[PDB]
Design an enzyme around this catalytic site. Structure first.
Site, mmCIF file in Angstrom:
data_model
loop_
_atom_site.group_PDB
_atom_site.id
_atom_site.type_symbol
_atom_site.label_atom_id
_atom_site.label_comp_id
_atom_site.label_asym_id
_atom_site.label_seq_id
_atom_site.Cartn_x
_atom_site.Cartn_y
_atom_site.Cartn_z
ATOM 1 N N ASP A 4 59.914 68.785 40.704
ATOM 2 C CA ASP A 4 60.803 69.870 40.299
ATOM 3 C C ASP A 4 60.075 71.222 40.134
ATOM 4 O O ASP A 4 59.495 71.740 41.103
ATOM 5 C CB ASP A 4 61.621 69.465 39.053
ATOM 6 C CG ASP A 4 62.497 68.230 39.291
ATOM 7 O OD1 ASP A 4 62.572 67.716 40.436
ATOM 8 O OD2 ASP A 4 63.122 67.761 38.319
HETATM 9 C C1 LIG Z 1 59.218 64.263 42.355
HETATM 10 C C2 LIG Z 1 60.329 65.250 42.578
HETATM 11 O O1 LIG Z 1 60.103 66.469 42.620
HETATM 12 N N1 LIG Z 1 61.543 64.706 42.718
HETATM 13 C C3 LIG Z 1 62.731 65.495 43.009
HETATM 14 C C4 LIG Z 1 63.980 65.111 42.194
HETATM 15 O O2 LIG Z 1 63.840 65.344 40.796
HETATM 16 C C5 LIG Z 1 65.200 65.868 42.735
HETATM 17 O O3 LIG Z 1 66.364 65.353 42.137
HETATM 18 C C6 LIG Z 1 65.320 65.684 44.253
HETATM 19 C C7 LIG Z 1 66.459 66.506 44.846
HETATM 20 O O4 LIG Z 1 66.556 66.213 46.236
HETATM 21 O O5 LIG Z 1 64.120 66.122 44.897
HETATM 22 C C8 LIG Z 1 62.976 65.386 44.528
HETATM 23 O O6 LIG Z 1 63.145 64.022 44.857
#
Ligand SMILES: CC(=O)N[C@@H]1[C@@H](O)[C@H](O)[C@@H](CO)O[C@@H]1O
Ligand SMILES: CC(=O)N[C@@H]1[C@@H](O)[C@H](O)[C@@H](CO)O[C@@H]1O
Ligand SMILES: [Mg+2]
Ligand SMILES: [Mg+2]
Ligand SMILES: [Mg+2]
Ligand SMILES: [Mg+2]
Ligand SMILES: [Mg+2]
Ligand SMILES: [Mg+2]
Ligand SMILES: [Mg+2]
Ligand SMILES: [Mg+2]
Lengths: 741, 740
Positions: free
Chosen positions: B303
């Site tokens: 995130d």
């Molecule tokens: C590890 C990371 O950054 N995970 C994020 C997740 O929180 C988010 O909901 C998603 C949206 O497509 O993208 C990524 O999977």
């Protein structure tokens, strides 16, 4: 019927020559390298640059010459030793030690592209090795050296193919040198006097052999049917410098190991060399034709072998006064190469297979290829007639293959019947289609060829475009980017096709970064034009980060180049029931599987809309990886395996179509034909003179009050023809068949 | 043993929380159970959850440069809609910051920027009116947009059909008022949160590129992307510091938005440095504050993680206690595990406790164990400190087989930790992945969206997934490293993989002779170079050579410039060390042997097999690869091109692989490639599993090894020890065995 057929003769084979002449209806005999008694037209093949070792052995510095590129050798210290001949056939090629190597050769650091100073290298006195010092370690190095060609490439190929063993090798000679030129003309003058019975001098061919170089294992090394490699000499190179104002490098011939392949985006040095050679070749061809004519004989040119510099599709070819061109026919494209040449009185097709033991050997059935070649040439002949046909090689070899002998009887009769019924005029063509590439008219029907009549894995997906077109009911022309930039797009053209891989003469390279070209094509399509792009059309690498096909907007498709992976691609649902694909049969079970598996739903970083299973049913040849629709308003007709094979896009009043590849087959010719009618908004015009069966075609001859229907397959075919009035008429064609109405 | 396990909990679920905490050995609880003796995690969201602030300072939302669709001019005027291709609930054109100063109208046909005097922004609609331009060219606007909806909160809303729920507006601490508000708020929150032990920052200040379209679908994503980090204030400051002015084009990047796959430009690297300095200073302050309040500070690897740069030097100076991240597979486990500058690491395992997998009729234990096995093989190579789960505990509690599965996993996670002391297994070779990025993108090559390899990427991502649990030491190095310092003398094998003109192959750096000299000399001296896909490729530099190191690996790609040269393929060598574990298919081999090789034909070369031998999934084809000479060893060359080859090069070797999707067989293939290319075939057997479905980890200190079963099926295997002795194992489903 009888006639319009050339038979090859052989000595001590009088009875069978006479028998086959009668069987096949021969009206000319091509003598070996009772023929008088038959009283047919006599051809003698003439070889201006060989068949006289007793001359060239006395003048060995007058053999033709070629720049050769060695293998790349790695420097492991600040030095490298480069063997000249380890990768070449030493019976064919010999390094030229007479002409100052430091003036004529180049050692290149391929890792940097820099020419190594001649102060840094020496040619070994005792072996064919260049010793190089004062250079960078861990780079790769090559020598480009002048070599004498000591064995005529084609005669050599003939020797090797026929296992002629110890038969003397014919040494070629180059008429650029005045001594040899005088010999050739003097000898021809005498031959004419000594050959009163010859009706046609079949020059096979003239002065410069197309690039054909063999390796140390006696295999082909380098081939280009259009290639100018075998055309240099110290004198011609120096003369060129004086006439053109700059000195050619060996690099201008070896071209980084490409040898100026016709697929390369042409360079000014290539065009200049072609211009230089052609002026010289044409002057001398004219003299040979004039001598033939004064002796009461026709002058005929073989389209091949020593045909470099003749340029049959360049203005002025008619001024040579050649009576005829005869060429090799193995398919429709190679037929059209011959048939469309404007500057001669008549044309002749010498059909493949050649009567050599590479095809005519125990266990093989040559009649199969024989008839396949005929089916492909036949559709082209209906679009652009050739005057005459025939065969070449050892008649006694073909004679031992009764099934093939029968096949020739059939073809010859049918060739004559086609001529008789059509009156020898071209079928009526229904749309004007222009192939656009770097070469244009000068390479009419010649795009995508490497070796004549031999498409391969790398080329067949594009050669299939010309092969489909060669026998199709449209009018095909060849235009260049220069033409379009100088004059716009001719108002009679309905469809422009641009096809090939990126960075080639066929797509065009960085010409697609020229805003005037893009403006011209875009404005023309928007007004009602049709642009059909195949493979990587209008591609220009690294010009725009987000756009590879410069006309992606027109055809609705671009190719992902791994720069735009952050951008989700959304594919609209495929339209399986469409005019273009109407004739494609899909297995019911395959279509069900495709319907049942559905489309990918959007997923982060993966886009959406791609079918999970393929619809299939069309052979598109080599894939173009990661093609995708530029927006959801493009119509996808095939988008299997997560990328696009076939799409159509409305663009103003006109249309773009994308095809990823198009190997030739009857079905694919029909697919392309539907593309041309659809893209030009002429769907209404398709019906008239159509065949319901996709594997049959129609040719309409309004003048003769006639149409014919051909079966393009070796299987029985039933088909229904639609006349211009609306009425239908039915046919039941045997294998490879034809019917007339 | 107990602990190293974080349990999720929820309102009104005290009984079951204590029960599962006890059953699973949980020592931490995350969001009246606040009064249990457990470590309490609370998530913190620094740039959202405060619409009361940001609605009065809306010019302080984060911003992004957006690129419109390409609009065709059909005369000397064109109107360009700004917002038709974007989600209007997420993004709004910035009308406050002078568009003529901050935006660019571009003629994409020529690349020229259209002069300010030739365009105006409509007062009433989001349309730019352009005049005085060329007909039949395509035009775009690059404009600043405020991001008015936090992209991850938006994603969760859309995904979970939250309907009328208030949208959370994000804010950008680059602006001093918002910055002061964020810190004052946190100061106050710490005071008000006495039972919280661990602040789980989810995450910090800048969200990875995540933009949606007008159909509410994802439009642009880059897990590493810096698009959502601009403002007029920040742009002016960058100029002040770096001494040059960035263009909107430096962000939109022709429509590529600076994908990590693009060969990085100076402007991208300067922006990352600029951004990371700011982010880092501000993270350290958050961590300093947490610590002053007696709390630990934990960062989510995802995130709003942009600018943290966990693999760049100085990360340790932040004083972050921990990183927690999403366990998606082996590669994503290593992304977390290998971070050096924190005290401990934590994986959040799958499945998420949610109705999408926890529904009657489903068996979530399958996914649970799939996830554990994929992570566990990586954890042996690089231990992570803690595990845990997220979501609704009340959902997981209803699936007793799943509960029993977690009991087993948690016990095994702790057992491994105890037996190994948290020490990495011995690596048997030193392997360096060489690309434009190097260390700063450790385990991060080939990713677009986190844990979501796709058609375009999986043939390369499989390299990392294979390595993630492999018995070798893996490092990530850059061309800049190699050019400055040479090749470190402890490296056994270099791998370069990817398509042409990407950060992963390297682009025109392969035309720099110092790079070519350094790599060639090193291989000649006994190094090993493994190139995958289009290794060392440089387009249009040499007419005759596309892969600049074709001589090393013995393979080049035909680019339709060299069709005149006949290509001659030597006979394939089907029996070879490298392919020794590839499953044989007798009928395929029989038909291949029977069909033979093409004889030479004009313009078609010769030697290619008429039928394919097959047997190996090489992923996406690389068309028209061919052997550069007949002394190269072809190991697979089906369908008229080359998929796998090895070449001797002085003392060392090159190997070409056209593609490498992950599988047990393909990871074994790569492993054999590494040992063979480095002339270490004699070293291969020590601490190895005969069965490719199992893996071995040796702990020479602890005097110990284990063997793990990477599958859900029984597996027999023979392990070979350093002394040549062997031991046979019969490993149950997902099992592990330890020996002295
Ligand atoms: C590890 C990371 O950054 N995970 C994020 C997740 O929180 C988010 O909901 C998603 C949206 O497509 O993208 C990524 O999977
Ligand atoms: C039309 C033409 O030029 N044909 C030549 C043929 O004469 C020659 O023997 C062969 C060698 O490979 O190449 C071409 O097919
Ligand atoms: Mg060779
Ligand atoms: Mg006569
Ligand atoms: Mg670039
Ligand atoms: Mg869109
Ligand atoms: Mg409007
Ligand atoms: Mg400032
Ligand atoms: Mg070029
Ligand atoms: Mg099988």
């Amino acid at each position: 019927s009888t006639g319009r057929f050339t038979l090859p003769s052989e000595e001590n084979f009088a009875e069978k020559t006479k028998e086959l002449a009668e069987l096949w209806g021969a009206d000319a005999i091509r003598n070996s390298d009772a023929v008088l008694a038959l009283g047919k037209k006599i051809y003698n093949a003439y070889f201006p640059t060989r068949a006289h070792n007793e001359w060239i052995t006395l003048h060995m510095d007058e053999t033709p010459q070629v720049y050769l590129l060695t293998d790349r050798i790695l420097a492991e210290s600040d030095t490298v030793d480069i063997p000249l001949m380890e990768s070449f056939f030493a019976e064919q090629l010999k390094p030229n030690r007479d002409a100052d190597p430091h003036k004529y050769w180049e050692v290149v650091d391929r890792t940097t592209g820099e020419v190594v100073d001649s102060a840094n290298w020496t040619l070994d006195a005792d072996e064919d090795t260049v010793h190089v010092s004062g250079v960078a370690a861990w780079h790769e190095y090559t020598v480009s050296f002048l070599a004498y060609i000591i064995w005529d490439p084609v005669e050599m190929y003939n020797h090797l193919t026929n296992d002629w063993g110890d038969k003397e090798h014919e040494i070629p000679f180059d008429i650029y040198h005045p001594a040899t030129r005088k010999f050739v003309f003097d000898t021809f003058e005498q031959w004419l006097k000594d050959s009163p019975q010859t009706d046609v001098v079949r020059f096979t061919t003239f002065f410069y052999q197309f690039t054909l170089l063999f390796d140390e294992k006696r295999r082909e090394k380098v081939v280009d049917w259009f290639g100018c490699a075998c055309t240099v000499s110290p004198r011609a190179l120096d003369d060129f410098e004086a006439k053109y104002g700059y000195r050619l490098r060996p690099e201008d011939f070896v071209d980084g190991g490409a040898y100026n392949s016709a697929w390369r985006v042409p360079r000014k040095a290539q065009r200049d060399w072609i211009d230089f050679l052609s002026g010289f070749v044409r002057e001398n061809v004219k003299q040979l034709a004039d001598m033939s004519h004064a002796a009461g004989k026709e002058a005929m040119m073989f389209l091949g072998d020593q045909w470099i510099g003749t340029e049959p599709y360049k203005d002025g070819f008619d001024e040579l006064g050649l009576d005829a061109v005869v060429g090799s026919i193995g398919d429709g494209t190679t037929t059209r190469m011959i048939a469309d040449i404007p500057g001669v009185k008549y044309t002749e097709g010498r059909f493949l297979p050649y009567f050599f033991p590479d095809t005519f050997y125990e266990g093989n059935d040559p009649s199969i290829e024989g008839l396949d070649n005929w089916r492909k040439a036949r559709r082209a002949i209906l679009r652009s007639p050739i005057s005459r046909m025939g065969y070449g090689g050892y008649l006694s070899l073909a004679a031992k293959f009764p099934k093939f002998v029968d096949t020739v009887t059939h073809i010859a009769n049918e060739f004559r019947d086609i001529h008789d019924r059509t009156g020898g005029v071209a079928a009526e063509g229904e749309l004007n289609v222009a192939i656009l590439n770097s070469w244009g008219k000068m390479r009419s029907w010649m795009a995508f060829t490497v070796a004549h009549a031999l498409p391969n894995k790398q080329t067949y997906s594009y050669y299939g475009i010309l092969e489909s077109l060669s026998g199709m009911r449209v009018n095909v022309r060849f235009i260049s980017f220069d033409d379009v930039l100088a004059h716009g797009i001719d108002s009679d053209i309905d469809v422009i096709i641009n096809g090939g891989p990126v960075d080639t003469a066929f797509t065009g390279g960085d010409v697609w970064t020229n805003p005037k070209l893009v403006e011209t094509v875009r404005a023309w399509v928007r007004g009602g034009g049709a642009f059909v792009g195949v493979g990587e059309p209008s591609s220009a690498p690294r010009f725009q980060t987000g756009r590879f096909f410069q006309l992606a907007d027109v055809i609705g498709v671009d190719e992902e180049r791994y720069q735009t992976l952050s951008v989700d691609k959304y594919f609209p649902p495929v339209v399986p029931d469409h005019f273009i694909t109407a004739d494609v049969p899909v297995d019911p079970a395959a279509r069900e599987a495709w319907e049942q598996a559905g489309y990918r739903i959007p997923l982060s970083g993966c886009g959406g809309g791609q079918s999970i299973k393929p619809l299939g049913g069309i052979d598109f040849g080599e894939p173009v990886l990661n093609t995708y629709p530029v927006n959801e308003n493009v119509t996808l007709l095939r988008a299997d395996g997560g990328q696009v094979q076939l799409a159509t896009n409305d663009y103003g009043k006109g249309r773009g179509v994308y095809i990823s590849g198009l190997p030739y087959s009857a079905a694919n010719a029909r697919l392309l034909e539907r593309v041309l009618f659809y893209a030009s908004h002429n769907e209404d015009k398709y019906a008239a003179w159509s065949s319901s069966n996709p594997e049959c075609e129609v040719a309409h001859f309004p003048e003769q009050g006639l149409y014919c229907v051909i079966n393009n397959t070796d299987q029985p075919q039933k088909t229904t023809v639609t006349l211009a009035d609306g009425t239908t008429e039915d046919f039941d064609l045997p294998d490879s068949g034809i019917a007339w109405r």
